[PDB]
Design a protein around this ligand. Structure first.
Ligand SMILES: Nc1ncnc2c1ncn2[C@@H]1O[C@H](COP(=O)(O)OP(=O)(O)OP(=O)(O)O)[C@@H](O)[C@H]1O
Ligand SMILES: Nc1ncnc2c1ncn2[C@@H]1O[C@H](COP(=O)(O)OP(=O)(O)OP(=O)(O)O)[C@@H](O)[C@H]1O
Lengths: 181, 159, 594, 208, 597
């Protein structure tokens, strides 16, 4: 009986559904994992990739016996080509990593001091892209029709932030449209 | 739901009169009440008394000052209006009006109003004696949830 | 022009349906003015465009009038005036607009100025207290070569076209056009217009308590001059406009604003928070309740809904407020037809209570607070040079008091110099003054309401009832009613008081103000030999009983004794001075004297 | 005029929601308005004996007159219009102590629901038997689960496995299970995750 | 030069402390709700900004708006035309050289002042974007005039091929800014030898105007540039301040943050407020419990009814303190002045009581009669404080009779007759006829003739002089601790941090609690006071038959209901109760008896 935050998710579990996705690491170490979704390996070999789930690798980084590789779109020479396909296209957002905002904030706690020169560049190249999304979202909701929308490429976070008001405005106007006849 | 928002909203008054002459008075002697006599009616009994007869008992007159001298003011600028001191709610009183009335004329024109008030409200949500606050207060509940969502969503996103 | 003229012409086909309901109106107002002028043996050119006919079906044309009101109004005039001739050209003056409606949040209280809408449509309300002069102005003079018999044509542009900042003509009158003919000017075919500025204060109740009232000014035109008496709740609407060169017309220009705020506006309206038109319904009901023979008593009790008793006082106020007539003597001095009551009482007994709510239902009778500077009835020759060569006797306090009521307080807490002024305005309806200028007898119909306090506490009973304030009897003889409010202590009396104040911390008023202002327009009887026979008997017995008792009365007291009953018949709304009126008049004085 | 006191009854009911739901979880429920509801219990008494007179005359006097039928409706309608409010205030009263009943449903000396609002702890003592009938029912929902799942708290998801926690305002020896942690005054810990969940909600440890 | 512009557009889109990205995170938040303004923060702005100010100190009057052109070019990046220009607001705090070093090394440097603002002028307009026509040749241009050297930064030239000075100011496409010429006054405490204070002048921009009322403490930071008016010897000019940002103290129009009211509600639930204030209001006053409670209810007040008729009630209370010298009626009154939101202190000799309320005089421009001055119009919403109600007989009584009881004056002097609003609250402290004889004779001889002022005030204390041998020695023990040693300044600071309330906390919550709740008393109290009065009048009625005259009339009976409404503003409860009201009469029942003995 929460009675506090029921109609939506709190921002502490929206990270909980994304932490259960796997990425690639660079292992270091040599039974091991019987965790019912495990794929424990043998004496593991370095200089190789492996699809490993995220949350155990963060725990594996606190004891500091492995290292992380960034995903393939996390260079500054890649994000620039995203900002051109949108600046020529004011209709919608073009190309989306789908969980990008919550992915960076986990990646900036002893997962930043590993990569090759991302400070004073990466937070530059992200926080610009947050608002350019939300500038696009302000023109969209002014164009609100009845009972039919077009959201194609939205992060999970804005979906947790557009949510608790976009219902009851169109719901309250659903009454006056329908109870008129 | 037991509807604590609008059970008081039907507690408001409403001026209408009669079609017959009835000795049932509770308002204080002179038990026959003469017909066509304008009476302040609470909304709850007056909602169904205009239904129960063919010819019902209460002459439902429209309070057309809540029709004509505000339809103009909302057909101009839906930004800063007296939506409030004329009627302490503007929403369910408009709902239960249109159920007996069933006229699509004003049913179009408040549908323009709400998105315009909503267009302010979302992009007013990122972070003085008697009359003014309740312009800013009828909107409150509608967005009291919303900016409280934005408040925590920063506080996770930073340290 | 094609871009700046195209949406003119597209509007020129658009707004012609927006006077489907006025194209009858604009020609019906002139056809009789054309008729009566041909058979004498009068109205300006007012074309009220509502909002409704220009908001239901035009949106691009709409918001141009409320964003940039400078490229649209002389379009609307030029396309108007052709319809004046296309309707009316057979019988042998530009018809500018007014634009009434709502506005949607432009009730700028002029304590606030705008950053958003400068140079836009503004709705302003308040009070005016300046009322400057009137002065004509040329717009177009026609010249005529008296040799060769040929004419000429010339128009002067100024800061009066309201919109277009044209190249001015810094000239008064030209001579010698390109010929050898001495130029002659026809002044009957030269057109004129007037010019009047007025400053508007702030409505000093809704401006919050952090400042004195501010002011701006407005230039209007002929159509609504002399409409603005100083002391009216006015509401104007016009364009916002700057003029004047700020920064270049003198050199170095340090700390000098050169952007005067002006309003070149239209269509004022008096408001009320004189024009109250009532239907057949309410005019009949007020006759229907006139048929009751009790409504003089109901109005007494339905006036002050806070205070117990004093029904002798309560009937007096409504008797005074409605007013008794003065029939002017033909080739003779008219008498006093004003009524002037007075009060006195030991403190905190609601003597000043009922004095402030007579001002709410005052019907354009704005009073002072009795602060007795010289100016209570005079001018003090304040001219302010009125633009270098005009001296004006500026109206102090009697232009507001005319056919109204005033109230002043603290008589004994005053100097001498006001008391000599209240002597003159009571014995005579007019003041006449020549301070550094002109002797002028301006007329005034006033009626004071007094409030003073006794001196030595509760000393009224143990001494003489007279001399109890000992202000000069020049006024007491010029007044009639000296109500002495008692404050006696009875255990049922105060207990009744105690709940009634308590029950109010949590037959109607606007009907009452209609009834009296309808009763100022009904005829005055004055004529019944029966009622005059009984009152003189009623006088003679107290004429035996004034001198051997309390207070000597005089012959002018008889002019009260007609006047109270004369107004008492005005409550009745009849033309027969009855008998019943003479009984309340005698009985009211009997409490006033005993 | 008629249901007027119920309007100001549900009006002050609105204040009880905004006090709790805006500030924090700490309720301190105000009071029960027995004095106010006794007034409307008086008016419903007078109104009920009003209609049985006309229930007595409908066969003898006006003879089931159409006027009297409407005179039954106003007396019918004003009953239920009053009936709508008086339970709504009753529900919003009891739909907030359950939240008090849920969050401290038994974690450390459950039946000490004392030291808690004594001026209203006699008020809700008539509601305590209602309250404990949640508490008795919430016990068998803890045991009727076929496996041991916590239903007492732990609503925020866990993140890590090592959390620095300090202590104050507490003394004694607690935590006989899961290894005794030996709580001395004003001395921090550095422990695993799952242990402190039954103590933070208890309110003994202070800061995460 | 330029390029400075590139040193700042590449500077404000990335300055941050550790991962908060603040200036984009507020400009985005400031373009939305329309304000168009900035602030600056700390040191590296200072750290390299001095390295910009070492090329901005030479002229911080033209390249201060070279900041201003930059942030518009970052503004359009956050849009995708209706775009205004912006303004700047600064912050700096080291000290306050009050009014001394003001010509030598302080022309066009950044100064900080502390003053009391006294006089506001009416608004005006200067332009910032114009359009210009050549006369007979019809050139069209547009010039922007941003920052100033008052008028005439640049002029209009002669080149359009048409005639000389052919240029004119249309009013069709123009923007405008407003200036003030509000006057500043020195805070009257910092330089005492024998001098009188001086005064300066200043202007401002629109998105920081109308932010001050006269009668406040204020601090201000800005430039010290120089204009030259041609309406005195050699070509001499005058001084003035160009202000930038008022980071003032509180207003002393009810918008503020939320954590302030959180503690207030956390304090207001603890029901010990009525007794804890009486110790914590005056930390320098031995006891005086009946008087001390009268002051806290005076500061907040009651309400105001505009009830659906014409008239109104007066929701206020006004107290008096008369008694022997040496009973601290004086120095108690300075104590209410600092704690009030708005307070004046004109306590002496009436100060020409006709010129207390209004003044009119001739004018330097246009020779006119307008309204300027007053002691009451300055002091609305708050409390005045005066004294010496024996030896003023001239006009002091005839000036307060109208000013009180209806609070609606209108001056009928040579110009206007306007009813300006007033909602004031008075306070006085007089002397009787040398004190002891008025307490050793018949109880008359207080005011020389008239008691009509005394009926207009409700609350009256009459203190006296006892000789209790244990209460004086404590007082003689009290004041040496507060004079020297200042040990109670260490004691009261020790009971402050968990139990008592300092001065700066009391002020802020009074303006909050007054401007939020609106009380009303319960109808169960209506039987209570009615039964109270009938014997109170009778206790007076039994006294008059014994040939004892004077004063009680009915203003006090409608004054007790404001008194019981007062603590309802304190508890912020929308009703009033019986343990509420029985303590209220316990203050006034105590002051009924001393009206007889
Ligand atoms: N005789 C009365 N009957 C009822 N109420 C009264 C009476 N006298 C005073 N009051 C109450 O007292 C309040 C104020 O009275 P008020 O201030 O007008 O006295 P006053 O007429 O001004 O006397 P003064 O001019 O001597 O001060 C009013 O709200 C009114 O309700
Ligand atoms: N009850 C008290 N508690 C603390 N200090 C007091 C008290 N009464 C007087 N004092 C002290 O008296 C000192 C000087 O006050 P002062 O002698 O000026 O009073 P006063 O103005 O003479 O009194 P009065 O106003 O009656 O003439 C102050 O420092 C004040 O602390």
């Amino acid at each position: 009986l929460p009675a506090h935050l029921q109609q939506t998710f709190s921002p502490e579990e929206i990270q909980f559904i994304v932490e259960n996705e796997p990425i690639k690491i660079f292992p270091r170490i040599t039974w091991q994992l019987i965790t019912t979704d495990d794929k424990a390996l043998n004496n593991m070999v370095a200089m190789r990739s492996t699809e490993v789930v995220l949350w155990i690798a963060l725990l594996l980084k606190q004891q500091s016996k492995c290292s992380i590789v960034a995903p393939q779109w996390l260079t500054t020479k890649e994000l620039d080509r995203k900002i051109q396909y949108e600046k020529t296209h004011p209709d919608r957002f073009s190309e989306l990593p789908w969980n990008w905002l919550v992915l960076a904030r986990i990646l900036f706690n002893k997962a930043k001091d590993d990569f090759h020169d991302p400070i004073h560049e990466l937070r530059g190249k992200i926080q610009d892209l947050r608002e350019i999304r939300q500038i696009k979202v302000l023109k969209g909701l002014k164009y609100l029709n009845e009972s039919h929308l077009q959201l194609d490429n939205l992060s999970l976070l804005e979906i947790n932030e557009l949510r608790p008001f976009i219902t009851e405005i169109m719901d309250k106007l659903r009454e006056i449209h329908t109870a008129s006849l | 739901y037991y509807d604590i928002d609008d059970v008081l909203a039907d507690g408001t008054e409403f001026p209408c009169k009669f079609q017959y002459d009835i000795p049932g008075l509770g308002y204080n002697p002179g038990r026959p009440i003469t017909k066509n006599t304008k009476l302040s009616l609470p909304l709850w009994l007056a909602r169904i008394l205009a239904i129960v007869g063919p010819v019902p008992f209460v002459e439902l007159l429209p309070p057309d000052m809540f029709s004509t001298k505000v339809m103009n003011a909302i057909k101009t600028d839906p930004v800063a209006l007296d939506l409030h001191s004329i009627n302490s709610h503007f929403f369910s009183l408009a709902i239960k009006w249109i159920m007996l009335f069933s006229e699509k004329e004003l049913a179009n024109v408040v549908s323009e109003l709400l998105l315009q008030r909503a267009q302010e409200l979302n992009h007013h949500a990122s972070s003085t004696s008697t009359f003014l606050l309740k312009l800013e207060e009828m909107e409150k509940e509608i967005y009291k949830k919303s900016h409280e969502s934005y408040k925590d969503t920063k506080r996770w996103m930073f340290k | 022009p094609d871009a700046v003229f195209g949406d003119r012409v597209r509007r020129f086909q658009e707004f012609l349906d927006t006077f489907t309901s006025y194209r009858d109106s604009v020609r019906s107002i002139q056809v009789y003015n054309s008729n009566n002028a041909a058979n004498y043996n009068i109205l300006p050119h007012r074309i009220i465009i509502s909002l409704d006919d220009l908001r239901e079906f035009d949106r691009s044309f709409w918001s141009g009038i409320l964003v940039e009101p400078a490229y649209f109004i002389p379009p609307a005039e030029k396309a108007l005036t052709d319809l004046a001739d296309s309707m009316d050209d057979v019988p042998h003056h530009p018809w500018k607009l007014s634009f009434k409606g709502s506005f949607g949040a432009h009730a700028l209280s002029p304590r606030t100025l705008t950053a958003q809408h400068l140079n836009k449509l503004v709705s302003v309300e308040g009070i005016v207290t300046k009322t400057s002069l009137v002065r004509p102005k040329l717009i177009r003079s026609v010249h005529y070569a008296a040799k060769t018999g040929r004419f000429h044509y010339r128009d002067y542009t100024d800061a009066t076209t309201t919109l277009t900042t044209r190249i001015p003509t810094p000239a008064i009158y030209p001579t010698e056009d390109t010929e050898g003919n001495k130029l002659t000017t026809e002044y009957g075919y030269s057109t004129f217009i007037d010019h009047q500025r007025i400053t508007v204060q702030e409505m000093p109740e809704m401006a919050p308590a952090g400042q004195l009232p501010r002011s701006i000014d407005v230039i209007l035109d002929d159509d609504l001059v002399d409409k603005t008496k100083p002391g009216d709740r006015v509401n104007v609407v016009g364009v916002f406009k700057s003029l004047g060169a700020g920064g270049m017309n003198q050199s170095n220009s340090n700390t000098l604003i050169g952007f005067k705020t002006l309003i070149l506006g239209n269509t004022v309206y008096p408001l009320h928070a004189a024009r109250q038109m009532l239907t057949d319904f309410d005019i009949r009901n007020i006759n229907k309740l006139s048929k009751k023979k009790d409504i003089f008593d109901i109005l007494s009790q339905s006036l002050a809904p806070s205070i117990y008793g004093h029904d002798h006082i309560k009937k007096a106020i409504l008797l005074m407020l409605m007013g008794g007539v003065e029939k002017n003597l033909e080739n003779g001095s008219h008498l006093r037809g004003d009524i002037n009551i007075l009060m006195v009482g030991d403190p905190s007994t609601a003597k000043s209570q009922l004095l402030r709510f007579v001002l709410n239902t005052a019907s354009l009778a704005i009073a002072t607070t009795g602060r007795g500077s010289s100016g209570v009835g005079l001018t003090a020759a304040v001219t302010t040079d009125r633009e270098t060569g005009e001296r004006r006797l500026e109206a102090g306090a009697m232009v507001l008091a005319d056919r109204g009521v005033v109230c002043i307080d603290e008589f004994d807490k005053m100097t001498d110099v006001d008391r000599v002024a209240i002597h003159e305005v009571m014995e005579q309806q007019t003041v006449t003054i020549a301070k550094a200028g002109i002797h002028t007898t301006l007329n005034a119909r006033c009626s004071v309401i007094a409030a003073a306090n006794p001196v030595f506490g509760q000393y009224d009973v143990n001494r003489d009832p007279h001399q109890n304030i000992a202000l000069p009897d020049s006024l007491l003889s010029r007044f009639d009613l000296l109500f002495v409010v008692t404050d006696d202590i009875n255990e049922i009396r105060d207990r009744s008081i105690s709940e009634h104040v308590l029950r109010t911390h949590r037959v109607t008023i606007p009907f009452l103000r209609k009834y009296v202002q309808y009763a100022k327009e009904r005829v005055i009887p004055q004529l019944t030999q029966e009622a005059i026979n009984v009152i003189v008997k009623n006088y003679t017995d107290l004429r035996n009983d004034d001198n051997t008792k309390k207070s000597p009365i005089t012959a002018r007291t008889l002019e009260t004794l007609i006047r109270l009953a004369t107004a008492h018949a005005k409550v009745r709304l009849s033309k027969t001075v009855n008998k019943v009126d003479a009984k309340v008049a005698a009985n009211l004085l009997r409490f006033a004297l005993l | 005029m008629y249901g007027d006191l119920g309007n100001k009854l549900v009006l002050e009911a609105k204040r009880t929601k905004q006090l709790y739901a805006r500030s924090n979880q700490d309720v301190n429920l105000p009071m029960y308005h027995e004095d106010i509801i006794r007034n409307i219990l008086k008016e419903v008494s007078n109104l009920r004996k009003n209609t049985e007179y006309l229930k007595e005359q409908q066969q003898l006097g006006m003879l089931d007159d159409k006027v009297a039928k409407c005179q039954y409706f106003v007396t019918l309608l004003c009953m239920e219009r009053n009936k709508r409010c008086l339970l709504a205030y009753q529900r919003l009263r009891t739909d907030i102590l359950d939240s008090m009943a849920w969050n401290n449903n038994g974690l450390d000396l459950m039946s000490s629901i004392t030291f808690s609002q004594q001026d209203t702890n006699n008020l809700s003592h008539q509601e305590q038997e209602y309250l404990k009938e949640y508490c008795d029912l919430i016990t068998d929902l803890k045991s009727g689960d076929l496996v041991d799942i916590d239903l007492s708290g732990s609503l925020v998801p866990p993140s890590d496995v090592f959390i620095d926690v300090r202590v104050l305002k507490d003394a004694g020896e607690i935590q006989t299970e899961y290894g005794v942690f030996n709580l001395i005054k004003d001395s921090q810990f550095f422990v695993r995750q799952s242990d402190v969940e039954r103590l933070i909600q208890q309110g003994y440890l202070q800061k995460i | 030069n330029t390029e400075i512009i590139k040193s700042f557009k590449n500077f404000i889109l990335e300055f941050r402390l550790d991962s908060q990205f603040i200036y984009r995170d507020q400009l985005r938040n400031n373009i939305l709700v329309k304000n168009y303004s900035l602030t600056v923060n700390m040191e590296h702005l200072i750290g390299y900004n001095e390295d910009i100010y070492k090329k901005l100190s030479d002229e911080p009057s033209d390249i201060i708006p070279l900041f201003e052109t930059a942030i518009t070019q970052v503004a359009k990046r956050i849009s995708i035309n209706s775009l205004p220009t912006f303004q700047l607001i600064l912050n700096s705090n080291a000290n306050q050289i009050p009014l001394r070093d003001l010509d030598s090394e302080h022309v066009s440097k950044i100064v900080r002042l502390s003053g009391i603002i006294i006089s506001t002028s009416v608004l005006s307009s200067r332009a910032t974007y114009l359009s210009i026509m050549c006369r007979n040749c019809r050139h069209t241009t547009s010039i922007t005039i941003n920052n100033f050297n008052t008028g005439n930064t640049v002029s209009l030239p002669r080149s359009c091929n048409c005639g000389p000075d052919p240029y004119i100011i249309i009013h069709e496409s123009s923007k405008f800014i407003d200036q003030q010429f509000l006057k500043l006054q020195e805070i009257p405490e910092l330089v005492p030898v024998g001098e009188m204070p001086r005064n300066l002048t200043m202007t401002c921009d629109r998105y920081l105007t109308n932010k001050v009322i006269p009668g406040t403490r204020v601090t201000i930071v800005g430039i010290y540039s120089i204009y030259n008016s041609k309406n005195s010897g050699v070509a001499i000019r005058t001084p003035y301040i160009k202000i930038l940002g008022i980071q003032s103290d509180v207003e002393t129009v009810t918008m503020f943050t939320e954590e302030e009211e959180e503690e207030f509600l956390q304090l207001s639930r603890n029901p010990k407020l009525y007794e804890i204030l009486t110790n914590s209001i005056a930390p320098s006053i031995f006891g005086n419990e009946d008087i001390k409670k009268a002051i806290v209810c005076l500061l907040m007040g009651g309400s105001k009814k505009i009830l659906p008729d014409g008239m109104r009630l007066r929701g206020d209370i006004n107290v008096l303190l008369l008694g022997d010298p040496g009973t601290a009626k004086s120095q108690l009154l300075k104590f209410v002045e600092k704690v009030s939101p708005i307070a004046v202190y004109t306590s002496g000799k009436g100060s020409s009581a006709a010129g207390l309320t209004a003044s009119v005089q001739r004018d330097p421009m246009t020779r006119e009669f307008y309204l300027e001055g007053g002691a009451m119009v300055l002091a609305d919403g708050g409390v005045v404080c005066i004294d010496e109600f024996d030896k003023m007989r001239d006009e002091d009584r005839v000036a307060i009779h109208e000013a009180m009881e209806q609070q609606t004056i209108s001056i009928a002097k040579a110009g206007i007759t306007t009813v300006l609003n007033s909602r004031t609250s008075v306070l006085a402290a007089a002397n009787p006829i040398y004190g002891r004889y008025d307490d050793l004779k018949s109880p008359g001889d207080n005011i020389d003739f008239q008691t009509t002022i005394l009926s207009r005030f409700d609350m009256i204390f009459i203190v006296k002089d006892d000789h209790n041998e244990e209460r004086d020695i404590s007082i003689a023990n009290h004041v040496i601790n507060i004079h020297t040693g200042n040990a109670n300044a260490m004691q009261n600071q020790q009971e402050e941090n968990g139990s008592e309330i300092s001065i700066e906390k009391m002020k802020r919550y009074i303006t909050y609690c007054r401007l939020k709740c609106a009380p009303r008393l319960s109808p169960q109290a209506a039987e209570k006071l009615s039964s109270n009065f009938v014997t109170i009048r009778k206790q007076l009625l039994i006294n008059e038959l014994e040939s004892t005259e004077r004063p009680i009339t009915i203003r006090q009976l409608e004054a007790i209901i404001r008194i019981t409404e007062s603590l309802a503003k304190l508890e912020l409860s929308p009703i009033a109760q019986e343990r509420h009201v029985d303590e209220a009469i316990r203050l006034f029942q105590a002051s009924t008896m001393d009206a007889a003995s």
